[PDB]
From Swiss-Prot:
It comes from Severe acute respiratory syndrome coronavirus 2 (2019-nCoV). May form homohexamers. Interacts with N protein. Inhibited in vitro by GRL-0617. Coiled coil: none annotated. Responsible for the cleavages located at the N-terminus of the replicase polyprotein. Participates together with nsp4 in the assembly of virally-induced cytoplasmic double-membrane vesicles necessary for viral replication. Antagonizes innate immune induction of type I interferon by blocking the phosphorylation, dimerization and subsequent nuclear translocation of host IRF3. Also prevents host NF-kappa-B signaling. In addition, PL-PRO possesses a deubiquitinating/deISGylating activity and processes both 'Lys-48'- and 'Lys-63'-linked polyubiquitin chains from cellular substrates. It is a multi-pass membrane protein. This is Papain-like protease nsp3. The chain holds residues 1025 to 1191 of 7096 of the full protein.
Amino acid sequence: VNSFSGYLKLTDNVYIKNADIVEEAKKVKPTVVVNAANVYLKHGGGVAGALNKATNNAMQVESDDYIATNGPLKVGGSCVLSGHNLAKHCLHVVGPNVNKGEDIQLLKSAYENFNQHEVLLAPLLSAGIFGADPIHSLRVCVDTVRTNVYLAVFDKNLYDKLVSSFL
Ligand SMILES: Cc1cc2c(=O)n(CCN3C(=O)c4ccccc4S3(=O)=O)nnc2s1
Protein backbone atom coordinates (compact mmCIF):
# COMPACT_ATOMS: atom_id res chain seq x y z
CA VAL A 1 0.00 0.00 0.00
CA ASN A 2 1.19 3.51 -0.89
CA SER A 3 -0.24 7.03 -0.67
CA PHE A 4 -0.95 7.62 -4.38
CA SER A 5 -4.63 8.57 -4.65
CA GLY A 6 -7.19 8.89 -7.43
CA TYR A 7 -5.34 6.90 -10.09
CA LEU A 8 -6.95 4.68 -12.70
CA LYS A 9 -5.29 1.27 -12.88
CA LEU A 10 -4.23 0.46 -16.45
CA THR A 11 -2.29 -2.78 -15.85
CA ASP A 12 -0.80 -4.81 -13.01
CA ASN A 13 1.87 -2.13 -12.51
CA VAL A 14 0.86 1.07 -14.38
CA TYR A 15 -1.51 3.70 -12.97
CA ILE A 16 -2.60 7.07 -14.40
CA LYS A 17 -4.12 10.33 -13.12
CA ASN A 18 -4.96 13.74 -14.62
CA ALA A 19 -2.67 15.77 -12.38
CA ASP A 20 0.11 18.35 -12.16
CA ILE A 21 3.26 16.37 -11.36
CA VAL A 22 4.61 19.29 -9.31
CA GLU A 23 1.53 19.23 -7.09
CA GLU A 24 1.47 15.42 -6.93
CA ALA A 25 5.11 15.30 -5.83
CA LYS A 26 4.57 18.10 -3.30
CA LYS A 27 1.60 16.19 -1.85
CA VAL A 28 2.93 12.63 -1.97
CA LYS A 29 6.67 13.27 -1.51
CA PRO A 30 7.41 10.03 -3.39
CA THR A 31 10.68 8.17 -3.13
CA VAL A 32 11.31 8.92 -6.82
CA VAL A 33 9.94 11.62 -9.11
CA VAL A 34 10.96 11.35 -12.76
CA ASN A 35 12.06 14.46 -14.64
CA ALA A 36 11.72 14.77 -18.42
CA ALA A 37 15.35 15.83 -18.77
CA ASN A 38 17.61 16.71 -21.67
CA VAL A 39 21.23 15.59 -21.94
CA TYR A 40 22.52 18.91 -20.56
CA LEU A 41 20.11 18.91 -17.60
CA LYS A 42 19.00 22.39 -18.70
CA HIS A 43 15.58 22.54 -17.08
CA GLY A 44 14.00 25.23 -19.22
CA GLY A 45 10.43 24.26 -20.00
CA GLY A 46 7.83 21.54 -19.92
CA VAL A 47 7.95 19.23 -16.94
CA ALA A 48 11.63 20.00 -16.30
CA GLY A 49 11.01 23.74 -16.13
CA ALA A 50 8.09 23.20 -13.75
CA LEU A 51 9.95 20.81 -11.44
CA ASN A 52 12.95 23.12 -11.30
CA LYS A 53 10.86 26.24 -10.63
CA ALA A 54 9.20 24.41 -7.73
CA THR A 55 12.67 23.79 -6.21
CA ASN A 56 13.51 27.52 -6.40
CA ASN A 57 16.24 26.67 -8.98
CA ALA A 58 18.05 24.28 -6.59
CA MET A 59 17.55 21.46 -9.10
CA GLN A 60 19.34 23.52 -11.77
CA VAL A 61 22.23 24.40 -9.43
CA GLU A 62 22.73 20.74 -8.53
CA SER A 63 22.41 19.73 -12.20
CA ASP A 64 25.03 22.23 -13.37
CA ASP A 65 27.53 20.76 -10.90
CA TYR A 66 26.64 17.25 -12.10
CA ILE A 67 27.28 18.17 -15.76
CA ALA A 68 30.51 20.02 -14.95
CA THR A 69 31.81 16.83 -13.31
CA ASN A 70 30.35 14.11 -15.54
CA GLY A 71 29.48 15.64 -18.90
CA PRO A 72 26.16 15.21 -20.69
CA LEU A 73 23.85 12.24 -20.36
CA LYS A 74 23.02 9.97 -23.29
CA VAL A 75 19.65 10.12 -25.02
CA GLY A 76 17.88 7.16 -23.43
CA GLY A 77 19.96 7.51 -20.26
CA SER A 78 19.39 8.81 -16.77
CA CYS A 79 20.95 9.93 -13.52
CA VAL A 80 19.71 10.01 -9.93
CA LEU A 81 19.95 13.37 -8.17
CA SER A 82 18.23 14.94 -5.18
CA GLY A 83 14.47 15.30 -5.15
CA HIS A 84 14.84 18.55 -3.17
CA ASN A 85 11.47 19.57 -1.67
CA LEU A 86 9.53 17.35 -4.11
CA ALA A 87 10.70 13.78 -3.48
CA LYS A 88 13.55 11.85 -1.92
CA HIS A 89 15.23 11.44 -5.32
CA CYS A 90 14.76 12.78 -8.82
CA LEU A 91 15.44 10.35 -11.66
CA HIS A 92 16.38 12.57 -14.61
CA VAL A 93 15.51 10.53 -17.72
CA VAL A 94 16.25 11.65 -21.29
CA GLY A 95 13.63 10.55 -23.78
CA PRO A 96 14.22 11.26 -27.47
CA ASN A 97 13.18 14.73 -28.62
CA VAL A 98 11.34 14.47 -31.93
CA ASN A 99 11.82 18.20 -32.53
CA LYS A 100 15.57 17.42 -32.53
CA GLY A 101 15.28 14.45 -34.91
CA GLU A 102 16.16 11.85 -32.28
CA ASP A 103 15.39 8.16 -32.77
CA ILE A 104 11.98 7.29 -31.29
CA GLN A 105 13.27 3.73 -30.80
CA LEU A 106 15.27 5.27 -27.93
CA LEU A 107 12.02 5.76 -26.01
CA LYS A 108 12.09 2.13 -24.86
CA SER A 109 15.67 2.52 -23.58
CA ALA A 110 14.56 5.65 -21.71
CA TYR A 111 11.71 3.80 -19.97
CA GLU A 112 14.05 0.93 -19.02
CA ASN A 113 15.62 3.28 -16.48
CA PHE A 114 12.37 3.11 -14.48
CA ASN A 115 12.97 -0.60 -13.76
CA GLN A 116 15.80 0.31 -11.37
CA HIS A 117 13.22 1.77 -8.94
CA GLU A 118 10.40 -0.12 -7.27
CA VAL A 119 7.90 2.79 -7.34
CA LEU A 120 7.97 6.07 -9.30
CA LEU A 121 5.88 9.15 -10.00
CA ALA A 122 6.47 10.05 -13.63
CA PRO A 123 5.37 11.96 -16.72
CA LEU A 124 4.99 10.30 -20.08
CA LEU A 125 8.46 10.32 -21.61
CA SER A 126 8.99 12.31 -24.81
CA ALA A 127 5.49 13.82 -24.49
CA GLY A 128 4.70 17.52 -24.39
CA ILE A 129 7.43 19.71 -25.86
CA PHE A 130 9.55 16.64 -26.68
CA GLY A 131 7.16 16.11 -29.61
CA ALA A 132 6.31 12.40 -29.54
CA ASP A 133 2.84 10.83 -29.70
CA PRO A 134 1.68 10.44 -26.06
CA ILE A 135 -0.50 7.44 -26.95
CA HIS A 136 2.72 5.84 -28.16
CA SER A 137 4.61 6.94 -25.04
CA LEU A 138 1.98 5.31 -22.81
CA ARG A 139 2.13 2.13 -24.90
CA VAL A 140 5.93 1.93 -24.60
CA CYS A 141 5.68 2.62 -20.86
CA VAL A 142 3.22 -0.23 -20.29
CA ASP A 143 5.26 -2.61 -22.46
CA THR A 144 8.64 -1.72 -20.88
CA VAL A 145 8.24 -0.73 -17.23
CA ARG A 146 7.77 -3.65 -14.83
CA THR A 147 8.02 -1.69 -11.59
CA ASN A 148 5.13 0.33 -10.17
CA VAL A 149 4.68 3.58 -12.10
CA TYR A 150 2.20 6.36 -11.32
CA LEU A 151 1.76 8.57 -14.38
CA ALA A 152 0.65 12.18 -14.04
CA VAL A 153 -0.84 13.67 -17.22
CA PHE A 154 -1.26 17.46 -17.01
CA ASP A 155 -3.80 17.83 -19.85
CA LYS A 156 -7.34 16.65 -19.09
CA ASN A 157 -8.33 16.23 -22.75
CA LEU A 158 -5.21 14.13 -23.42
CA TYR A 159 -5.76 12.01 -20.31
CA ASP A 160 -9.28 11.10 -21.47
CA LYS A 161 -7.92 10.19 -24.92
CA LEU A 162 -5.18 8.03 -23.37
CA VAL A 163 -7.69 6.23 -21.15
CA SER A 164 -10.37 5.85 -23.82
CA SER A 165 -7.87 4.66 -26.44
CA PHE A 166 -5.91 2.42 -24.06
CA LEU A 167 -5.80 -1.16 -25.30
C1 LIG B 1 3.90 20.50 -15.73
C2 LIG B 1 3.88 19.64 -16.97
C3 LIG B 1 3.37 18.38 -17.19
C4 LIG B 1 3.55 17.89 -18.55
C5 LIG B 1 3.13 16.61 -19.06
O1 LIG B 1 2.49 15.75 -18.41
N1 LIG B 1 3.47 16.39 -20.41
C6 LIG B 1 3.06 15.11 -21.03
C7 LIG B 1 1.62 15.12 -21.30
N2 LIG B 1 1.24 16.20 -22.30
C8 LIG B 1 1.40 16.18 -23.68
O2 LIG B 1 1.93 15.28 -24.36
C9 LIG B 1 0.81 17.43 -24.39
C10 LIG B 1 0.79 17.76 -25.75
C11 LIG B 1 0.20 18.98 -26.15
C12 LIG B 1 -0.37 19.84 -25.19
C13 LIG B 1 -0.33 19.47 -23.82
C14 LIG B 1 0.25 18.26 -23.39
S1 LIG B 1 0.42 17.60 -21.75
O3 LIG B 1 -0.81 17.16 -21.21
O4 LIG B 1 1.28 18.42 -20.99
N3 LIG B 1 4.11 17.35 -21.16
N4 LIG B 1 4.44 18.43 -20.72
C15 LIG B 1 4.20 18.78 -19.37
S2 LIG B 1 4.57 20.20 -18.53
